[PDB]
Amino acid sequence: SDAPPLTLEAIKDRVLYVLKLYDKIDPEKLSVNSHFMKDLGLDSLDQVEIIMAMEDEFGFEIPDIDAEKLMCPQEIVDYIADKKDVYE
Amino acid sequence: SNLTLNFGPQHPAAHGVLRLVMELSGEMVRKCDPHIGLLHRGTEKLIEYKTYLQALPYFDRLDYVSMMCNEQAYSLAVEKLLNIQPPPRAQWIRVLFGEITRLLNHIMAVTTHALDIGAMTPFFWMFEEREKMFEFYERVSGARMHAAYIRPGGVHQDLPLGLLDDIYEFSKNFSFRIDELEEMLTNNRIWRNRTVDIGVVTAEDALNYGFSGVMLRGSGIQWDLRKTQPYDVYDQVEFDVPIGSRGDCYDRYLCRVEEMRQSLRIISQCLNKMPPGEIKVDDAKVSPPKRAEMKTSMESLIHHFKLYTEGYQVPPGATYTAIEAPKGEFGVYLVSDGSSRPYRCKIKAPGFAHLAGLDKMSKGHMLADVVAIIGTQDIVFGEVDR
Amino acid sequence: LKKTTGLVGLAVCETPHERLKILYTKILDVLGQIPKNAAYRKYTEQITNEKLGMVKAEPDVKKLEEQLQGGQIEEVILQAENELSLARKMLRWKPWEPLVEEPPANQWKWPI
Amino acid sequence: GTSVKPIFSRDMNEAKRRVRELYRAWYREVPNTVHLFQLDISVKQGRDKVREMFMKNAHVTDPRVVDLLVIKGKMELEETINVWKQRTHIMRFFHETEAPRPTDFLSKFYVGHDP
Amino acid sequence: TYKFVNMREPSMDMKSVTDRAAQTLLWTELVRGLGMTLSYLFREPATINYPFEKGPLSPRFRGEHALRRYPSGEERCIACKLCEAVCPAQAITIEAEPRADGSRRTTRYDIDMTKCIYCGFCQEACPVDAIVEGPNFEFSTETHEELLYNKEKLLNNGDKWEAEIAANIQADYLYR
Amino acid sequence: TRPTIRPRNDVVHKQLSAFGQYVAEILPKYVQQVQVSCFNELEIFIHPDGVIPVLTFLRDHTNAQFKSLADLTAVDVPTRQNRFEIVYNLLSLRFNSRIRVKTYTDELTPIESSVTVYKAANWYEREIWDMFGVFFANHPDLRRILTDYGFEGHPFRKDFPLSGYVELRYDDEVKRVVAEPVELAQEFRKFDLNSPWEAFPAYRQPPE
Ligand SMILES: CCCCCCCCCCCC(=O)SCCNC(=O)CCNC(=O)[C@H](O)C(C)(C)COP(=O)(O)O
Ligand code: SF4
Ligand code: SF4
Structure with a gap:
């Protein structure tokens, strides 16, 4: 059979694993609702690298638009849920 | 995926420092990308830091097979900007040595094309003739190739006292050497197989892409700058212009051979019609005086000093001067700001446009056909890169 | 009748008179949509009318070629198609309007 | 006013979007460059160098200048991908044979006359 | 005024067809080419026995540079x-001062032979025939530094080659 | 005035003047100036926006037919606000004539690519971009053509130094060719040749 029925909890776990895998972010400091620019003092270029890491993690192309707004982990989870049609 | 291959610069078929990046399916050429600039020396900026006489030896080294033809084009541009006129004997000398130079260039082109194709023998037969013409160059100027003989006022020195006789002796034997070359190549079925219907270009395409010279005449376009826009004494000589029918490599080869014959005709005429007189313009504010005058007369010494330190000033203005060089239309866009140094010198070389069209001419051909096309375009990268 | 136009990629034209008449009529039709006071329209109309009259008055192809001074009537046909394409482009461009912008005072001053 | 004609972008937002796109392309290219050219640097070093080159021009406020900078960066990326460049060209970014030139007053005073 | 190079039509009579068939099947033009090469085999080669035999040259030949003297042994160069000024390659470097006897002479006269283009403009420009391009061309060195000529080297060249240089000038100065 | 002075041709001068007037009347939207040089060389100054129309008209018009582009280059004049002067040279085989079209631009303003009008321009526009830094809009494949890979700056610009900023040498420690700041064993010697006395009265400028 094909891939399992991915859920929101899996998306959040993978996204937070990716963020804690980033060197410029101290792991235990980041939260699900922490704004990338304000909370972690990340620049615009840093956000681009994180979005590309998401594209590698979940295997789908996130355009330049719709990536300019994913500014905290929760928005990333919502975007992936919308793109993959996951509700529960 | 197409195979991607580097053709040159260190390749025998490259004809210089060319990096031809080629996309191939099997041996079929899917794409040609000529990468040039491996012989870009920044000649035009350097010419900007020189005086008009100091910039002349650069035109020797632009196209190193047609030195005096390059010198003549530059001299015509500067003379047009100076509003002066070379004397008649100088103009006859210029046309004679331009035709000798055309012989040199056509020998080099045809034999290197044959050598790429695989016919190595005619090169050795024709390079002895090239050697004798190099001797003619040397007797007149002291240099085998970069003579710097043609100057914006005429020529540097008068012919030595027995040069015309030797030029006649050489010219009365050359036709048999052309005949031996044609026996080797013209009717060979292998040569025709390697040349007929290879690199066919239409008249419309040749005109739009900027082609000139043989690349036009092989496609039936009737255009020769010596006939349509004559310079020096080209209006006083008689010759035919070879014209092709099919626009392929074979037709371009026949055109060059016949061009060689017509150059012999023009040389014969120039030998029988050389007039007497002085060799540079009798105007010591442009052309240097003789050394005896320079050592006897105050004005002559002052003008020698000033012409060799500062140089003559050229009135402000811009010209585009073109000649029928052996490789096509060779041009200079020369901009003078009023001083003794050129403000701008743009050099137009036919090989630039021919190489820019190489990719078009190689559609649907193999590797060996691309080698033949590079040979038939008559490319020297000194003029392409500058 | 004639073989070998002599220029590579230029086919010999059978029935060149009809082609020339059609092309010149199309050219005049396109020029009819340009303002009458535009110089392009009047110049092109004048030359096209002369060429059309020459084509109508001379049934012989070689004599017509010598009258037209256009070099081998197939080339005359090609030039007519070029002029038609240019006429459509000029209709779109409208180059008869007043100069778009005036250059800086010392822009074309030479020397320096 | 100031009556200028754009190249690609009408304001700094579109120019920033193009900058981000070019940065994404360079970021993706770096590992392939390290593999193909057989470079002795890490992928981390290459991406750090890409970021440093991008940040060299962070002070630009003209959308036309930014458009030209993106055009030049795209030219360099196309050049790198097609292997027109050699290992020497890629390594020219790191200045490995250049001795560090000091910036403080005293060392400059010691070495010579240039400021 | 023009001619055609490839606008000839072949005859279609039976004799011409048979001749062309013989050319195709028995390879006549290939034997013609073989005959041409065989003819060249029996000619005398145009090769010369270098270094024993030399290529012809001219009095105007441009070679290695030299600084000359007057017959008294005084240098011709007056700085x-x-x-x-005229050198297009900027290959000449000159420094001068008054000599101990007040003469206007050089203290430095260098020619960078790896900058020089061997154009001969300097010997044209010289008003006293001090700098010349002598006839020598066999002066290849094993190091780059040996091709950076100072005044001593050029004066030595003049002393070494004066006999031939004067004879070359005598044969060409009336064309100058 | 006879032997050493270049002769004049007034017939060609008149023909070129009339044709310049013709071109100016047909395209008033773009033509700013028309000149005929003393040695019979027609020049037409235009507005940049008219690069594509003018050339198209010049190559297509029945009375023009300039189907061949000799060459295309640029001139740098730093004193002008629009630094760069774009020069097109065209040849007409039907009428055996030549024409020069000139326009202007600066560092940040693109010029329309004329590859569509003339196929020959491709490499000419690439060369202008490489040597001068003039961008051409809608160009098929615009990239450096003459300079080295990764070379910074444009050499033909007046401000650029003659010997540039970097040189190359082989370095054995890194086992490759490296680029370093230029050092010269002998500096190029700048000559001041301009004479303090005026040469050509006909070109004297007003004393401001
Ligand atoms: C293998 C290694 C070789 C290296 C390859 C060479 C790469 C060369 C590429 C050069 C191209 C450029 O410079 S492209 C020009 C870049 N400059 C600008 O865009 C000016 C405005 N500055 C900003 O927008 C911000 O400072 C910014 C930091 C950009 C982030 O922006 P955010 O506020 O949105 O995070
Ligand atoms: S021959 Fe004389 S003028 Fe010419 S480059 Fe050499 S030193 Fe300079
Ligand atoms: S031109 Fe002659 S005299 Fe003058 S410095 Fe040179 S060598 Fe000496």
Whole structure:
């Protein structure tokens, strides 16, 4: 059979694993609702690298638009849920 | 995926420092990308830091097979900007040595094309003739190739006292050497197989892409700058212009051979019609005086000093001067700001446009056909890169 | 009748008179949509009318070629198609309007 | 006013979007460059160098200048991908044979006359 | 005024067809080419026995540079610097001062032979025939530094080659 | 005035003047100036926006037919606000004539690519971009053509130094060719040749 029925909890776990895998972010400091620019003092270029890491993690192309707004982990989870049609 | 291959610069078929990046399916050429600039020396900026006489030896080294033809084009541009006129004997000398130079260039082109194709023998037969013409160059100027003989006022020195006789002796034997070359190549079925219907270009395409010279005449376009826009004494000589029918490599080869014959005709005429007189313009504010005058007369010494330190000033203005060089239309866009140094010198070389069209001419051909096309375009990268 | 136009990629034209008449009529039709006071329209109309009259008055192809001074009537046909394409482009461009912008005072001053 | 004609972008937002796109392309290219050219640097070093080159021009406020900078960066990326460049060209970014030139007053005073 | 190079039609009579068939099947033009090469085999080669035999040259030949003297042994060069001004390659470097006897002479006269283009403009520009391009061309060195000529080297060249240089000038100065 | 002075041709001068007037009347939207040089060389100054129309008209018009582009280059004049002067040279085989079209631009303003009008321009526009830094809009494949890979700056610009900023040498420690700041064993010697006395009265400028 094909891939399992991915859920929101899996998306959040993978996204937070990716963020804690980033060197410029101290792991235990980041939260699900922490704004990338304000909370972690990340620049615009840093956000681009994180979005590309998401594209590698979940295997789908996130355009330049719709990536300019994913500014905290929760928005990333919502975007992936919308793109993959996951509700529960 | 197409195979991607580097053709040159260190390749025998490259004809210089060319990096031809080629996309191939099997041996079929899917794409040609000529990468040039491996012989870009920044000649035009350097010419900007020189005086008009100091910039002349650069035109020797632009196209190193047609030195005096390059010198003549530059001299015509500067003379047009100076509003002066070379004397008649100088103009006859210029046309004679331009035709000798055309012989040199056509020998080099045809034999290197044959050598790429695989016919190595005619090169050795024709390079002895090239050697004798190099001797003619040397007797007149002291240099085998970069003579710097043609100057914006005429020529540097008068012919030595027995040069015309030797030029006649050489010219009365050359036709048999052309005949031996044609026996080797013209009717060979292998040569025709390697040349007929290879690199066919239409008249419309040749005109739009900027082609000139043989690349036009092989496609039936009737255009020769010596006939349509004559310079020096080209209006006083008689010759035919070879014209092709099919626009392929074979037709371009026949055109060059016949061009060689017509150059012999023009040389014969120039030998029988050389007039007497002085060799540079009798105007010591442009052309240097003789050394005896320079050592006897105050004005002559002052003008020698000033012409060799500062140089003559050229009135402000811009010209585009073109000649029928052996490789096509060779041009200079020369901009003078009023001083003794050129403000701008743009050099137009036919090989630039021919190489820019190489990719078009190689559609649907193999590797060996691309080698033949590079040979038939008559490319020297000194003029392409500058 | 004639073989070998002599220029590579230029086919010999059978029935060149009809082609020339059609092309010149199309050219005049396109020029009819340009303002009458535009110089392009009047110049092109004048030359096209002369060429059309020459084509109508001379049934012989070689004599017509010598009258037209256009070099081998197939080339005359090609030039007519070029002029038609240019006429459509000029209709779109409208180059008869007043100069778009005036250059800086010392822009074309030479020397320096 | 100031009556200028754009190249690609009408304001700094579109120019920033193009900058981000070019940065994404360079970021993706770096590992392939390290593999193909057989470079002795890490992928981390290459991406750090890409970021440093991008940040060299962070002070630009003209959308036309930014458009030209993106055009030049795209030219360099196309050049790198097609292997027109050699290992020497890629390594020219790191200045490995250049001795560090000091910036403080005293060392400059010691070495010579240039400021 | 023009001619055609490839606008000839072949005859279609039976004799011409049979001749062309013989050319195709028995390879006549290939034997023609073989005959041409065989003919060249029996000619005398145009090769010369170098270094024993030399290529012909001219009195105007441009070669290695030399600084000349007057018959008294006094140097001809007066440090006018016209050669340095005219040199398109900037290959000449000159420094001058009054000599101990007040003469206008050089203290430095260098020619960078790896900058020089061997154009001969300097010997044209020289007003006293001090700098010349002598006839020598066999002066290849094993190091780059040996091709950076100072005044001593050029004066030595003049002393070594004066006999031939004067004879070359005598044969060409009436064309100058 | 006879032997050493270049002769004049007034017939060609008149023909070129009339044709310049013709071109100016047909395209008033773009033509700013028309000149005929003393040695019979027609020049037409235009507005940049008219690069594509003018050339198209010049190559297509029945009375023009300039189907061949000799060459295309640029001139740098730093004193002008629009630094760069774009020069097109065209040849007409039907009428055996030549024409020069000139326009202007600066560092940040693109010029329309004329590859569509003339196929020959491709490499000419690439060369202008490489040597001068003039961008051409809608160009098929615009990239450096003459300079080295990764070379910074444009050499033909007046401000650029003659010997540039970097040189190359082989370095054995890194086992490759490296680029370093230029050092010269002998500096190029700048000559001041301009004479303090005026040469050509006909070109004297007003004393401002
Ligand atoms: C293998 C290694 C070789 C290296 C390859 C060479 C790469 C060369 C590429 C050069 C191209 C450029 O410079 S492209 C020009 C870049 N400059 C600008 O865009 C000016 C405005 N500055 C900003 O927008 C911000 O400072 C910014 C930091 C950009 C982030 O922006 P955010 O506020 O949105 O995070
Ligand atoms: S021959 Fe020419 S390049 Fe050599 S030193 Fe004399 S002037 Fe200079
Ligand atoms: S060699 Fe001749 S030109 Fe040169 S400085 Fe001496 S005298 Fe003057």
